[PDB]
Amino acid sequence: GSHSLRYFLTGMTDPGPGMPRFVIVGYVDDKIFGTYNSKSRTAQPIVEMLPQEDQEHWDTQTQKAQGGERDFDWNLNRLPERYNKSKGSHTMQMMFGCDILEDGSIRGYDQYAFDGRDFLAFDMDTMTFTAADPVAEITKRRWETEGTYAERWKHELGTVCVQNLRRYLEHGKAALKRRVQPEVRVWGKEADGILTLSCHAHGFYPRPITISWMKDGMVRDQETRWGGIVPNSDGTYHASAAIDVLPEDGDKYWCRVEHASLPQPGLFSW
Amino acid sequence: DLTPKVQVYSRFPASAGTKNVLNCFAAGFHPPKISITLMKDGVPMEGAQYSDMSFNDDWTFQRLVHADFTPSSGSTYACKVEHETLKEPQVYKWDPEF
Amino acid sequence: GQAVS
Ligand SMILES: *C(=O)CCCCCCCCCCCCC
Ligand SMILES: [Cl-]
Ligand SMILES: [Cl-]
Ligand SMILES: [Mg+2]
Ligand code: NA
């Protein structure tokens, strides 16, 4: 019965035409609750999840996100030269947040990447840093010697994140609890004398799902390919599995789909 | 290996002449700059929208592009992806499954 | 966080 809050921060030297150079996406469990970007310069809730938000709270989120924008711009102007890299474009990333476990205990997370590679991590429980390489080590030693970062982020992860997680869970409880059954389609195309049975589960929420193929009532994983779980724009998800089958055996296979919206797992055929 | 991994799929199970949403999801790539273009018979679809740039636990980037459309049995739909790791644009054809 | 040096 645990819950999670995560922030995904990206700064970019070359985001693409018309693209913000700095973006924040925030998630509560597997649901986007709000975003920030350097073009609008405003942090805004996803009103479908959070329909009655007070401006005070998002004034606060905006300010804090704008500070993150300045720091990422600061880093992107200094780190490429410190790494002696000739790369054209550069990226800076950070993911941080907290978990509240079922028994009420707390976990904090705080990790950075530069050009898509581990850079620095902070462990709130020990209040210690980990550098990914000797260049990041210089930052680690500076941060820990000044002492201020550990205190700020122990408070941020262990107190502020937890408070906001509880707020978002309450404010967005209708959205978070509303289950959406998948619509399952099973298809078959016959190429080169073999039949590909594909199973597609459309538009489910929440995110966890399993899809298995069976023959004569016995699961068959060795010949199965899974497409993975991918997003729809409305907060639901999509997932798929395929298996290759002799066309003469096409009626003997069953797709098994298990989802929290289904009291019992669903069995589907071609 | 940091090339985009691309899936094309409709929001709802597809049925000719019934309104739907076409999705093109690219993931696993770096750097984040990417062109993703939904197309009907080689013509960009109108009203397409893209997700705010985000990334996976392994730091690789991800982007979903979607557009409302009404699948025609007479038409070919596809997603054109253009990225620094690719020397030429990659066109991913939607399998309609109907 | 600024990655000072
Ligand atoms: C240096 O490490 C920069 C730290 C940046 C922290 C910014 C956190 C912003 C939180 C609110 C985001 C609201 C939008 C989802
Ligand atoms: Cl059908
Ligand atoms: Cl049937
Ligand atoms: Mg149309
Ligand atoms: Na079906």
Author numbering:
A (entry chain A): 1 to 270
B (entry chain B): 2 to 99
C (entry chain D): 3 to 7
Publication text:
Here, using a mammalian recombinant expression system combined with mass spectrometry approaches, we identified N-myristoylated peptides as endogenous ligands for the chicken MHC-I-like protein YF1∗7.1. YF1∗7.1 exhibited the typical architecture of MHC-I and MHC-I-like molecules in which the heavy chain was composed of the α1-and α2-helices that formed the antigen binding groove and an α3-domain that was non-covalently associated with β2-microglobulin (β2m). The overall pattern observed for bound acylglycines and glycine lipopeptides was that the acyl chain, which is similar in all molecules, and was inserted into the A′-pocket, where it could promote anchoring and is protected from exposure to the aqueous exterior solvent by the A′-roof, a structural modification seen in human CD1 but not MHC I proteins.
Next, both teg-1 and teg-2 peptides harbouring a C14:0 acyl chain were commercially synthesized, and YF1∗7.1 was refolded in vitro in the presence of the individually synthesized MDV-derived M-myristoylated peptide epitopes. Examining this interaction in more detail, within the YF1∗7.1-C14:0-teg-1 complex, the main chain of P2-Gln contacted Asp71, Trp74, and Asn75 via VDW interactions, whilst the side chain was solvent exposed and interacted solely with Trp143. The P4-Val backbone was buried within the pocket whilst the sidechain was entirely exposed to the solvent. P4-Val formed a main chain hydrogen bond with Thr139 while establishing VDW interactions with Arg82, Thr139, Arg142, and Trp143. Finally, the P5-Ser side chain was also solvent exposed and interacted with Arg82, Ile138, and Arg142.
